[PDB]
Amino acid sequence: SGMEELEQGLLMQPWAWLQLAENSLLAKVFITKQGYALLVSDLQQVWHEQVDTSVVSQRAKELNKRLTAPPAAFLCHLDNLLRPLLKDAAHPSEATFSCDCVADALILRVRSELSGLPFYWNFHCMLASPSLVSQHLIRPLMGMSLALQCQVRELATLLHMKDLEIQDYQESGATLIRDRLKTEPFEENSFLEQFMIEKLPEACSIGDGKPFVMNLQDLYMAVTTQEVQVGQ
Amino acid sequence: SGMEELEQGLLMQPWAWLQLAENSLLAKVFITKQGYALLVSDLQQVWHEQVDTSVVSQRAKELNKRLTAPPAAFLCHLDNLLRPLLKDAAHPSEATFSCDCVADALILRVRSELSGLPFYWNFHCMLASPSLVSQHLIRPLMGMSLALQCQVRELATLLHMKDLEIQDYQELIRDRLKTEPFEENSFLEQFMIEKLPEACSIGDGKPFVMNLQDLYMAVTTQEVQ
């Protein structure tokens, strides 16, 4: 069904950072002519909304007296709004975002323009099911950490071979006395222990989530894509 | 209080893998004389339990009517059956474990013996709050990916420095002993195409427990302040 395909598409969207009036949110959205699926998080809680075209028609009529248009045209505009600002927030937007909470609900409010008139849309988000949190956050973040650890082991392997080649020159007479500061042979235990002491505090810093969005989305999409394809 | 301290200690705890006749679980637990806090996951859902001395006293008496010592001694035995088994799965266990789902709840059952008598415990778990899920999984797992990415970038910088030293040594020895110069983008591309499918598979959560817990612990430690 159309709703299944929104949730499917949503799983393979990357996360964007979203500047709001007061705070910020992480956001991923997937929009077609049939509706949208949205996932939003503030790194404490996760919220979700799914809508079809009836709901688009209904709510566009509630929020907008000054114009009307087919549901798909409204869905198209929302995509135009959310798309460029996802990729970077150095894009001249002219659209504004705010949100407020009411128990297990988050309302994300948008003001933009359409047909040279003001346009309003509200996303009514409810706390995401544990299955959606698991699917979009826990499993992929776990898969990513494993993949990054494998990258690390592979680079350690490459380093030992570089050192072996360096040893090969040394043993054949290339240098007889140490005459300059060169790198020390790579030792993974001391690399790790120095990293945790010197680099870990700052390297693991989540912050407002922007590091995640700017550094790790290629890997994230590659990982969520792999599970979709495995889960068939 | 009692519970805030138990929750704090649970957060410092690593994740462990737990075998059970039917399936397996990811588990972490923190037991003192004041009770315990438990987190459990099958990778689709996350369950939580905390107990105090009142609950331990009530449940231990109910389950073991001909057993007489206070809660502290019971929590002491639970810890002796549990913690060694969570440190190594290959370690001879005096207990049997099973697991049952009743509605939205998870019940981990323990069967043991103490002093010629049978010893029984049930850990009754509810779905963990979004806040525990984020604290014990989402934020640390995010921390860990960022940290490991920094590692990769550091190892890339070191590989390139070694390459500069190698290219200096040719100011010539056997060609088959010469490595290819390191190029990061081409390393990443190759890895994503050839390695990523297998490298990211989580299976039953066992690789995450066997490979990543030292880093898991470093990251949760860091976030607390």
Curated annotation (Swiss-Prot), chain A:
Any GO molecular function: DNA end binding
Subcellular location: Nucleus; Chromosome
Residues with site note (Leu-lock): L117
Domain of life: Eukaryota
Effect after changing R66G: Does not affect ability to participate in V(D)J recombination
Outcome recorded upon mutating L117D: Impaired ability to repair double-strand breaks (DSBs). Abolished ability to bridge DNA. Abolished ability to participate in V(D)J recombination. Abolished interaction with XRCC4
Main subcellular location of this protein, as a coarse class: nucleus
Keywords: Chromosomal rearrangement, Chromosome, Coiled coil, Disease variant, DNA damage, DNA repair, DNA-binding, Nucleus, Phosphoprotein, SCID
GO biological process: B cell differentiation; central nervous system development; double-strand break repair via nonhomologous end joining; immunoglobulin V(D)J recombination; positive regulation of ligase activity; response to ionizing radiation; T cell differentiation; telomere maintenance
PTM comment: Phosphorylated by PRKDC at the C-terminus in response to DNA damage. Phosphorylations by PRKDC at the C-terminus of XRCC4 and NHEJ1/XLF are highly redundant and regulate ability of the XRCC4-NHEJ1/XLF subcomplex to bridge DNA. Phosphorylation does not prevent interaction with XRCC4 but disrupts ability to bridge DNA and promotes detachment from DNA.
Subunit field text: Homodimer; mainly exists as a homodimer when not associated with XRCC4. Interacts with XRCC4; the interaction is direct and is mediated via a head-to-head interaction between N-terminal head regions. Component of the core long-range non-homologous end joining (NHEJ) complex (also named DNA-PK complex) composed of PRKDC, LIG4, XRCC4, XRCC6/Ku70, XRCC5/Ku86 and NHEJ1/XLF. Additional component of the NHEJ complex includes PAXX.
Family of the protein in this entry: Belongs to the XRCC4-XLF family. XLF subfamily.
Protein known as: Non-homologous end-joining factor 1
Organism this protein belongs to: Homo sapiens
Curated annotation (Swiss-Prot), chain B:
Result for mutant: E183A: Does not affect ability to repair double-strand breaks (DSBs). Does not affect interaction with XRCC4
Mutagenesis or variant effect for I193A: Does not affect ability to repair double-strand breaks (DSBs). Does not affect interaction with XRCC4
Phenotypic consequence of L137A: Does not affect ability to participate in V(D)J recombination
Coiled-coil parts of chain: 130-171
Gene Ontology molecular function: DNA end binding; DNA polymerase binding
Effect on the protein of changing K28A: Abolished ability to participate in V(D)J recombination
Annotated phenotype, changing L117D: Impaired ability to repair double-strand breaks (DSBs). Abolished ability to bridge DNA. Abolished ability to participate in V(D)J recombination. Abolished interaction with XRCC4
Transmembrane segments: none
Effect of P118D: Does not affect ability to participate in V(D)J recombination
Outcome following mutation: C125R: In IMD124; likely pathogenic; abolished ability to repair double-strand breaks (DSBs); abolished ability to participate in V(D)J recombination
Remaining remarks: Was named 'Cernunnos' after the enigmatic Celtic god of hunting, the underworld and fertility.
Protein name (database record): Non-homologous end-joining factor 1
Classification lineage: Eukaryota, Metazoa, Chordata, Craniata, Vertebrata
Gene name of this polypeptide: NHEJ1
Full-length numbering of the shown residues: 1 to 227 of 299
